[PDB]
RNA sequence: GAUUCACGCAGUGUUAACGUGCAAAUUACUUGUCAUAUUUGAGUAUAGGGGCGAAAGACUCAUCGAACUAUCUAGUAGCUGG
RNA sequence: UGAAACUGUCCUUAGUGCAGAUCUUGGUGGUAGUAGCAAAUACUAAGAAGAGGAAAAAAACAUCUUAGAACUGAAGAGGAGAAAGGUUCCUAAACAACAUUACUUGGAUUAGGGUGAAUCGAUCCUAAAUUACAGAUGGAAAUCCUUAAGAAAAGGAUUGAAAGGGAAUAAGAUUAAUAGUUCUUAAUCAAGAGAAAUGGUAACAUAUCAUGAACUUUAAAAUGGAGUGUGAAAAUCUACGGAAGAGUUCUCUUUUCUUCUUAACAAAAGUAAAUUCCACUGAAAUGAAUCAAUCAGAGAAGUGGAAUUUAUUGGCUUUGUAAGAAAUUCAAUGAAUUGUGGUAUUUUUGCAGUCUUCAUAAAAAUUAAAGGGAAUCUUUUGCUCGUACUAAUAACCGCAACAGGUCUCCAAGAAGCAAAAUCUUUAGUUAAAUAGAAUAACGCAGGUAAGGGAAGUCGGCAACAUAGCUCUGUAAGUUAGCAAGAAAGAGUAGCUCUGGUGAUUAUCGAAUCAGAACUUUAAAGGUUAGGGGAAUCCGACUGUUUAAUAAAAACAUAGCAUUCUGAUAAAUCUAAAAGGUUCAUUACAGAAUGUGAUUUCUGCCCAGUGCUCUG
RNA sequence: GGGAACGGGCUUGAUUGGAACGGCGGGGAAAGAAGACCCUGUUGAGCUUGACUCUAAUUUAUCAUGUGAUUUCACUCAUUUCGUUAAAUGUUAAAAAAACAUUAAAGAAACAGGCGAUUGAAAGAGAUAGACGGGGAGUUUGGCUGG
RNA sequence: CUGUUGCUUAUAGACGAUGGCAUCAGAAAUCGGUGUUGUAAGCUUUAGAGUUUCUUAAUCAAUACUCUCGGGUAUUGAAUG
RNA sequence: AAUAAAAUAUUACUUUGGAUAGUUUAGUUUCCUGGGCGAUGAAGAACGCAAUGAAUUGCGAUAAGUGAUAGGAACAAUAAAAUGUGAAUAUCCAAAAUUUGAAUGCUUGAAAGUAUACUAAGGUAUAUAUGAUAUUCAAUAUCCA
């Protein structure tokens, strides 16, 4: 039952002041500063969390590999696979429907 | 005597509007050529809850007709609108629910809301939840139309005043009886600091004109003139009638 | 360990000690005392012996 | 406090400097009436209002 | 509890030292100095405060650059 | 915006202690309350015929049926003392 | 006595004669060696230093070490911070004054010493709000405006948080005192310098890889609370196998106790829980599923995959770090070891759906991606400021070493429903406004009592009494929810047993329930722990109130009702103002009032005074 | 006993040894406080009101010269109130689909002396004059008197 | 002669005072009497419901039998020596 | 009836206290002369500098003082050094003059800071209003080709 103390000068249990107590040599328990939980990317159309992109802080994506922050697809990384399939059908079917309605139908 | 609580309200120190989480200003987009001689199409992206008001607000996203990019407005939801809907605004718009047309194009008996009291001011009349205004008649001689205000009064407006077809959502809001003082406390979470109202007769003569003596009463008529100075104007002002109605 | 003017930074102290005594400095830590004097902890390169500089200056 | 501005600490340090007494050699000057420093204070006796 | 007990929570400064007069009279929330009349360019002096005039005025300081001018 | 216990909080009773006190309002038991009309830190806003008040003329630095401070001012006294 | 100025007479001049003014200032008596130095369980023995325990017991003796006995009892009298304090921190000399005795002690005197950052914060961003040039207003000081008025600022100025957002550091050791700051070791971050890809059907995946300008969009930073289930770690408890040391040992005890550890950052043997998608196929005799739910032909269950989260890489074990550290022992610097589990509790931390709102629960700095197609490993540096100490029954505010007040973090065992009362462990302390003797009255605090039982008294004021859990049982009245723990009755201990509630194919594990003999001092009661009933009045209820004599029937409240207003309005602040508040508003709204839940009912009067009129 | 009508001191008597300890609560008309109940001041303050005298806000009439036919009309030209990225004003020529829309190939009409509406010579501010005006300011509320 | 002082003095007592003894002073244990409570610790009664474990020995087991009218306390404001 | 411990009375000496007497480098009033500040940075505030200084005094990174001119042998609490080849002392002089302050590149809470141009560091300039001149512009505002 080793009781610990805050290492930094913050004395209040705010969200940015998260701590985890880990063990060390001789039964010593120290204080670790744990990070905050961050949300992931969402499809711009349906607002669903995309798959294949991690949930980390915005600056941490700079440290990520260039291929580990986006999905190799048209509108990948900003739209779900369903968000894009409807886009293709909308872009194609509407173009075909008016190709026979006007201009000397 | 002191200054009555009504006088202290015009100062605006603790009686300011608690508008921090409010979404913005709900009004029509600025009138231009495309809203005067053509139609623009808007896409209802989402419907949200604006604190301090009983009606939902819709985030409509019009494309910019003159430049490249979007143009995001904040309309008031007519009852029936849904996400992903297309709404058309202009002098040639279809007469569907949610479309915005000049008040001079709607036929007689059409129900509209968010009416402009002057062309280009983007919404004055019929804005509360469940409210609407009806079109009474047209006068093509001076291009003016008559509409019936939700209070029952009749008004004359120019035919160029835009309006949104339908009724405002969130109807029947006030039909639910508040049960607890806590529920009334939470009603003004995004409103002024006016809820717990102390009766004037319960105060002292310094604070209020009704501050009574050994028996809680008024002692003088509570129907006053409109010309009464601030501080003594309390109760009923320019009242033509009183009592209960049979 | 030195006492320097407060209006000098770690960069100017590092050059000043290098020029004044002809030594190599790899680390400087400074604290400003309550009276107003800035105390500088100057660490020399491992090749240069600090004990000989102290005797040369006059500390020994 | 543990945290203080740079100017505030220097004015704190001067208050430490001025909390001293007359040196012995000064008291031995001819025609000397200065034996004590009447501008003296102690942390538990008087707060310096700063 | 308006006497001894209510004094326990007094640990928030209202006035700090001012830059133009050096007194602890700079109001933090009002952003003005009660004594020397800060950012207001004119020094704060009043006829009813005649003693306040004889405590800080010309001749109460070193007079570094005016002692020579009048002597000259 | 149910019933209670606990960390805390208040102040119903003893009209107990104390009453040149631990204290210019505190202590002990008892009682009530002990999370949504809740408790609380910091920042910030509101100033004297003004502010703030779930309203007691309550609170506004131990000062309130009109704060503190300086000037008019050695205010006036058919009244009291010398 | 005193050691350098002074006196008498006449005129002149006046700040010219004191017993009083609750007179002003200063000094001093009786009271008086009197009242007091009585909250916070507590000290004793030996030794050392010291002038400072002597003596006809002068019954007491400050400080330090050891031993005994103890208290705070881990929501602490423990270990650390924010504000406030400002050198109070450490050491040495020294004790005139101060800490209601004394002091060798001290937060007290004297003199030195002490606060080390690329990674912790300020610095950076904006929130409520705040302040400038030009402009508007004013007799005036000055006020208004904060992007509207401007030839000012691709777009909107300044400040505003050491608890909001935020690039990057950990372990061990060291000092009389500093340490995510120094030393060793091990990392991390930023700014530099030296026609343009594959794979998978797909969800999607590739040590930087695999070009991507203007312009635009999206996402992140970035968002309430409750309650339920569960993954993981830590703490506690426990099973198995030992190693080392300690305690007990005349009565036993294969016994009781202590240690058996591991960081940042990365790696990928082995292997989890939950959610969402993808491919095959097409569900009815409808299935699938949770504690609850909930889902399906715009497609279920089944099989096979993909992705994300799980306190750093990738959650857990494991690995590099790294045993060389550290811990426990042994010897005189050198040697020994450092398995594996659990269908237990708590805390922390995420996740999954459910409920709730006339409440919907911030923004910017900064970053990434997309649409688009313009153009053709090594090494260097990382500046300024804060950093000591208390954070309180002695460092803060109250005149003080004041029983008052002041925001937080970490948190063991027993017992119990319980973070309750009570006792103990690690840590801290034995002093915190003086003691000894005697054991009078009157007191303050805690008690008991024969017989009676409110006869006392304004008044059951004060005290007594009931009290946990289980089973039975429970009235009138009622807004049909309650009253209700109504009221009332029975049981409860110890020892020895029996049975029920599961997992895996006989073993393994959990406290919980029920039952039966036997025994006794016949069992909730050491602590904790509701007195009950029958009515009347007021307020409907939860709530607030005269800080310091009134906590209530007073205020508030939801409900009911009335009045004005189409917004250039109504109310209303300002001397004025392209001024200000409700108003980021628009009659289901704003403003001004009376009554006070629900049920029932609101009677008659317009003469008078108000208010109003389309007259 | 008398006395200011309830003496510790005075008069006449009763009676007295100097210093005091622990109690207690009769007295010292005990201490604390220039009575707070009552009255008198040609002393005040809060509050109320058709008390007297006034005042902010409100309101009404006249004045302050926009043009063309005191009132009635039409216009805009000061003025009122608004809207924007002052982003197509005026006159001629000519609801099936929550997707994209930009940096042009080889085009995208001209002119008005008005940025767009709105109000409009009316309203608002100023001067003078009447009304209203406890919202507010100043002041007053005689004397004699078996209190 | 008297007082202080001693018996941590009593028939007394807030403190003084008062009462007793002071070398045959006094105090102390121990011993016996006299009281209070209720049968001590150790081994035995298979006391003993029962479960274990040999196999019909043991072990554990509230409570209960003998030693036991036991053990403990007893002036401190008791009484002999 | 009795003693004087206490109580009271006078004198002398001592004590606590600081009246009285003597004294003044301090004030008050009147009068005479001036009434001489600052963007060439004032008054005011802060910090710092003496061989041993805490205050005060003087001074400003050239620090209880530098140069020049007069001045002639000191200072002192204790040491040192320098000194008629010039010690103290004096001045309408010269050089120098930290952070701020009307404070003025921008910000300023107790804020540490920071942008550009000129001559890594250091030093200057850059606020608002404003008069004159030069220069670059804007407006079909009036004409005019």
Curated annotation (Swiss-Prot), chain B:
GO terms for biological process: cytoplasmic translation. Signal peptide: none annotated. Disulfide bonds: none annotated. It is found in: Cytoplasm. GO terms for molecular function: RNA binding; structural constituent of ribosome. It comes from the Eukaryota. This is Large ribosomal subunit protein uL2.
């Amino acid at each position: 039952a080793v009781r610990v103390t805050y290492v930094r000068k913050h004395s209040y249990n705010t969200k940015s002041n998260g701590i985890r107590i880990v063990k060390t040599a001789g039964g010593n328990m120290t204080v670790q500063h744990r990070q905050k939980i961050s949300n992931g990317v969402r499809c711009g159309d349906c607002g669903c969390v995309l798959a294949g992109i991690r949930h980390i802080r915005p600056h941490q994506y700079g440290w990520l590999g260039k291929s580990k922050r986006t999905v190799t697809r048209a509108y990948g990384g900003v739209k779900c696979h369903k968000c894009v399939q409807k886009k293709i059908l909308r872009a194609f079917l509407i173009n075909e429907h008016n190709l026979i309605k006007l201009a000397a139908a | 005597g002191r200054r009555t609580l009504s006088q202290r309200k015009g100062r605006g120190s603790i009686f300011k509007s608690r508008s921090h989480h409010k979404l913005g200003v709900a009004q029509h987009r600025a009138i231009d050529f495309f809203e005067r001689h053509s139609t623009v199409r808007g896409l209802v992206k989402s419907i949200e809850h604006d604190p301090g008001r009983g009606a939902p607000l819709a985030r409509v996203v019009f494309r910019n007709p003159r430049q490249y990019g979007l143009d995001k407005e904040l309309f008031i939801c007519a009852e029936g609108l849904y996400s992903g809907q297309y709404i058309y605004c202009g002098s040639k718009a279809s007469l569907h629910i949610g479309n915005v047309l000049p008040i001079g194009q709607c036929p007689e008996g059409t129900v509209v809301c968010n009416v402009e009291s002057k062309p280009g001011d983007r919404g004055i009349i019929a804005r509360a939840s469940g409210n609407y205004a009806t079109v009474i008649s047209h006068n093509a001689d001076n291009e003016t139309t008559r509409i019936r205000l939700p209070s029952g009064a009749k008004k004359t407006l120019k035919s160029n005043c835009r309006a949104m077809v339908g009724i405002i959502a969130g109807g029947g809001r006030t039909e639910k009886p508040i049960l607890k003082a806590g529920v009334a406390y939470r009603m003004y979470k995004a409103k002024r600091t006016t809820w717990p109202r102390v009766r004037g007769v319960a105060m002292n003569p310094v604070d209020h004109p009704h501050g009574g003596g050994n028996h809680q009463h008024v002692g003088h008529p509570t129907t006053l003139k409109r010309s009464s100075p601030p501080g003594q104007k309390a109760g009923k002002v320019a009242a033509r009638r009183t009592g209960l109605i049979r | 360990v030195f006492l320097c003017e407060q209006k000098a930074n770690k960069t100017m102290i590092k050059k000043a000690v290098e020029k004044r005594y002809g030594v190599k400095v790899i680390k400087v830590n400074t604290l400003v005392r309550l009276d107003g004097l800035k105390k500088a902890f100057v660490r020399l390169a491992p090749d240069v012996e600090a004990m000989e500089v102290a005797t040369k200056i006059g500390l020994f | 406090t543990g945290h203080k501005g740079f100017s505030y600490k220097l004015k704190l340090g001067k208050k430490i400097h001025q909390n001293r007494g007359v040196p012995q050699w000064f008291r031995m000057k001819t025609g000397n009436t200065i034996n004590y420093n009447f501008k003296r204070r102690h942390w538990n006796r008087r707060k310096m209002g700063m | 509890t308006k006497g001894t007990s209510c004094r326990g929570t007094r640990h928030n400064k209202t006035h700090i030292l001012c830059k133009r007069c050096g007194k602890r009279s700079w109001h933090l929330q009002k952003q003005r100095c009660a004594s020397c009349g800060y950012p207001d360019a004119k020094m704060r002096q009043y006829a009813w405060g005649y003693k306040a005039l004889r405590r800080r005025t010309q001749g109460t300081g070193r007079m570094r650059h005016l002692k020579i001018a009048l002597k000259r």
